[PDB]
Curated annotation (Swiss-Prot):
Protein EC: 1.1.1.21, 1.1.1.300, 1.1.1.372, 1.1.1.54
Subunit structure: Monomer.
Residues modified to Phosphoserine: 3
Activity modulation comment: Cys-299 may regulate the kinetic and inhibition properties of the enzyme, but does not participate in catalysis. Tolrestat inhibits retinal reduction.
Main location: cytoplasm
Family matches, as PROSITE patterns: ALDOKETO_REDUCTASE_1, ALDOKETO_REDUCTASE_2, ALDOKETO_REDUCTASE_3
Stored CDD domains: AKR_AKR1B1-19 (cd19107)
List of catalytic residues: 49
Annotated protein name in UniProt: Aldo-keto reductase family 1 member B1
Residues noted as binding substrate in the record, renumbered to the chain: 111
Similarity-based family: Belongs to the aldo/keto reductase family.
GO molecular function, one term: retinal dehydrogenase activity
Species this chain originates from: Homo sapiens (Human)
Length: 316
């Protein structure tokens, strides 16, 4: 297939990117350098990952070395939950631009639909461990994001972890100026998201699949948890194609016309994960992989389940 997908702002987004959540600051600079050398052109970042400065060091080194030009890169970051207030959005974006050492972002996402109390804590909790919400709503935050496009700080804006009703609220916003370009959501064979993906695609919103390998390094992983990389049924599909299970898991969302952002800090896996343009999964393979759905969600937090905008009470 084509290596880039067209967004509604007319820009082309590479369908394979590098994830950076949990990538330690002491290893992420090398990871991004190696990724750019072997062909990656899309990096997924966030302020909350606490490593944007070091990601920026890698990008600057490869620009200075003339391995790539800025126009060829697609850099994504996300507005954290403590900055949903209208007057905090520009400042949060500027801090990210400063750390990444860039003068614009290709895409900036609302990280989660839930606004939290502003302050220095990323997850402000009350005395009994509930997240403290802010009185912001999704629509006012969206208007502040639209301002960033008009001021030239970002080329495209989008959302992440929004359910279909929350997407709908934005699409029906009075005075909507820029539609969301992308909805970035958890997606893998144990959480296939057919309903939400169909909804988004029908509205012309591109879907990015996160945790495509099932996030085995997530901090709350338990030893008894399901493992996609070790699923013998997926191993057999990989073996039939002479590819690794990770390569099958990355190729899967690509054939559903999704963008996919696997994370690695290991140079040999960074290279392996990019070698996914030289094979195809059959229609039969795809239907079989879809059959493995178990509505098993890796990214959710119990402390957030009372927030009015918690996205995962709805079916999709
Ligand atoms: N918007 C949002 O709310 C969210 C966005 N994301 C984004 O999605 C990205 C990917 O999701 P993430 O949850 O990090 O996890 P992934 O599903 O990408 O899995 C990452 C794990 O897989 C390992 N791995 C990578 N490649 C291979 C391979 N070829 N063989 C064996 N193991 C491999 C990595 O190890 P190692 O690094 O040691 O090589 C790491 O432990 C995130 O980094 C982030 O950018 C993720 C969660 C939420
Ligand atoms: O958000 C990311 O990209 C990575 N990431 C995901 C999680 C799990 C979360 N679940 C929810 C959630 F269910 C919410 F409603 C709001 C949130 F901000 C989070 S964050 C996490 C926790 C702690 C640190 N990072 C996390």
């Amino acid at each position: 297939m084509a290596s880039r997908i067209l967004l509604n702002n007319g820009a082309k987004m590479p369908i394979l990117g590098l994830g950076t959540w949990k990538s330690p600051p002491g290893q992420v600079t090398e990871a991004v350098k190696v990724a750019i050398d072997v062909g990656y052109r899309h990096i997924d970042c966030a302020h909350v990952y606490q490593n944007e400065n070091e990601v920026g060091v890698a990008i600057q080194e490869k620009l200075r070395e003339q391995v790539v030009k800025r126009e060829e890169l697609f850099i994504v970051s996300k507005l954290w939950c403590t900055y949903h207030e209208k007057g905090l959005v520009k400042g949060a974006c500027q801090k990210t631009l400063s750390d990444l050492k860039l003068d614009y972002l290709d895409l900036y996402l609302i990280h989660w639909p839930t606004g939290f109390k502003p302050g220095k804590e990323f997850f402000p909790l009350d005395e009994s461990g509930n997240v403290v919400p802010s009185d912001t709503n999704i629509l006012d935050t969206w208007a502040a994001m639209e301002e960033l496009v008009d001021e030239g700080l970002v080329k495209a804006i989008g959302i992440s972890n929004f359910n279909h009703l929350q997407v709908e609220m934005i699409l029906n916003k009075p005075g909507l100026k820029y539609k969301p370009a992308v909805n970035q959501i958890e997606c893998h064979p144990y959480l296939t998201q057919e309903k939400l993906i169909q909804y988004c695609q029908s509205k012309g919103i591109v879907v990015t699949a996160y945790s495509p390998l099932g996030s085995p390094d997530r901090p709350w992983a338990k030893p008894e948890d399901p493992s996609l990389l070790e699923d013998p049924r997926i191993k057999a599909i990989a073996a039939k194609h002479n590819k690794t299970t990770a390569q099958v898991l990355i190729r899967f969302p690509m054939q559903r016309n999704l963008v996919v952002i696997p994370k690695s800090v290991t140079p040999e896996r960074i290279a392996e994960n990019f070698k996914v343009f030289d094979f195809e999964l059959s229609s039969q393979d795809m239907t079989t992989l879809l059959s493995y759905n178990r509505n098993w969600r890796v990214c959710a937090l119990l402390s957030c389940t009372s927030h009015k905008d918690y996205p995962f009470h709805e079916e999709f």
